[PDB]
Amino acid sequence: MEMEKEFEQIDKSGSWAAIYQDIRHEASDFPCRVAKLPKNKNRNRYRDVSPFDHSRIKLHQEDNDYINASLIKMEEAQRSYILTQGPLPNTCGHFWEMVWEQKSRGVVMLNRVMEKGSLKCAQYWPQKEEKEMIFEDTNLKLTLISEDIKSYYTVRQLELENLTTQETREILHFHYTTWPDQGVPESPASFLNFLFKVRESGSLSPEHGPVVVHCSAGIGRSGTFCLADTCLLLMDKRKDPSSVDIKKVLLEMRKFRMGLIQTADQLRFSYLAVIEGAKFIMGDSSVQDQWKELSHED
Ligand SMILES: [Mg+2]
């Protein structure tokens, strides 16, 4: 703020850690009473990552409305996201229920099922057309319709059906497969190429429910993705890159879910992504093709 001048200053002084720790210190603290109820213990993947009560997504069921998911409602930018953990073997039904009830068109997955030798996410979508999934608890059917596999991400068309009404919806699944846990994308280009693929699909548009974004905990990689997207949208409103204060935007997001952006290098990457993305916002449409080439997506 102005972001590029600030970036160079932080870099020169090597103060990313300090800047980041300051963000952690200033971040909102709100209760997560529901997340911590004994009955919800097996609905949380990580003991120390919980949705705030005020912003949690409620499932539309009388039995137990709890899922570890938060609505990030960015008022100034006029965009909302649902950030959630990687579903557990017992919460895959809840996950798709949330997708249905919230009217989401897209799901953005930023992790792999196995990372660092451990299971980070349930296999919550079908990998083969002929082997659809039925979630008996929430009465939903999920079918793989097609997939487009690129070098570092895959886009799937899924059909989600409410078996109670027989209504069906197409859900687009955007799976980034090369973003390491507690790490950063290979380049601003690869990240932005993917973000713009999600944008171009219509998944982020106001006529749909909020896009669902997740990684393993739904805070580190998910937070980075949403921060970059929101900053670029804010810039787009006024065509005024200088008006965007990335740290303030992140603090605003953290009012809705804890721990968004998990490392100083993820914060630094967010600046890189927004600064590079600004080229497109400010009218250099050709830069999108450059990102595609540099991403080596195939
Ligand atoms: Mg086959």
Swiss-Prot record:
Segments forming domain Tyrosine-protein phosphatase: 3-277
Alphabetic keyword roster: Acetylation, Endoplasmic reticulum, Hydrolase, Membrane, Oxidation, Phosphoprotein, Protein phosphatase, S-nitrosylation
Topological category with respect to the lipid bilayer: Peripheral membrane protein
Phosphoserine modified-residue sites: S50, S242, S243
GO BP term, example: growth hormone receptor signaling pathway via JAK-STAT
Enzyme class: hydrolase
Modified residues (Cysteine persulfide): C215
Site of covalent link N,N-(cysteine-1,S-diyl)serine (Cys-Ser): C215-S216
UniProt keyword Phosphoprotein, yes or no: yes
EC number(s) given by UniProt: 3.1.3.48
Coiled coil: none
Entry's Gene Ontology molecular function annotations: cadherin binding; enzyme binding; ephrin receptor binding; insulin receptor binding; non-membrane spanning protein tyrosine phosphatase activity; protein kinase binding; protein phosphatase 2A binding; protein tyrosine phosphatase activity
Modification after translation (UniProt): Oxidized on Cys-215; the Cys-SOH formed in response to redox signaling reacts with the alpha-amido of the following residue to form a sulfenamide cross-link, triggering a conformational change that inhibits substrate binding and activity. The active site can be restored by reduction. Ser-50 is the major site of phosphorylation as compared to Ser-242 and Ser-243. Activated by phosphorylation at Ser-50.
Assigned GO CC terms: cytoplasm; cytoplasmic side of endoplasmic reticulum membrane; cytosol; early endosome; endoplasmic reticulum; endosome lumen; glutamatergic synapse; mitochondrial crista
Residue numbers bearing the Cysteine sulfenic acid (-SOH) modification: C215
Active-site positions on this chain: C215
Positions contributing to substrate binding: D181, C215, S216, A217, G218, I219, G220, R221, Q262
Cellular compartments annotated: Endoplasmic reticulum membrane
Residues modified to S-nitrosocysteine: C215
Residues where Cysteine sulfinic acid (-SO2H) is found: C215
Expression across tissues: Expressed in keratinocytes (at protein level).
Role according to the record: Tyrosine-protein phosphatase which acts as a regulator of endoplasmic reticulum unfolded protein response. Mediates dephosphorylation of EIF2AK3/PERK; inactivating the protein kinase activity of EIF2AK3/PERK. May play an important role in CKII- and p60c-src-induced signal transduction cascades. May regulate the EFNA5-EPHA3 signaling pathway which modulates cell reorganization and cell-cell repulsion. May also regulate the hepatocyte growth factor receptor signaling pathway through dephosphorylation of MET.
Subunit structure: Interacts with EPHA3 (phosphorylated); dephosphorylates EPHA3 and may regulate its trafficking and function. Interacts with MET. Interacts with NCK1.
Recorded family membership: Belongs to the protein-tyrosine phosphatase family. Non-receptor class 1 subfamily.
Identification of the protein by name: Tyrosine-protein phosphatase non-receptor type 1
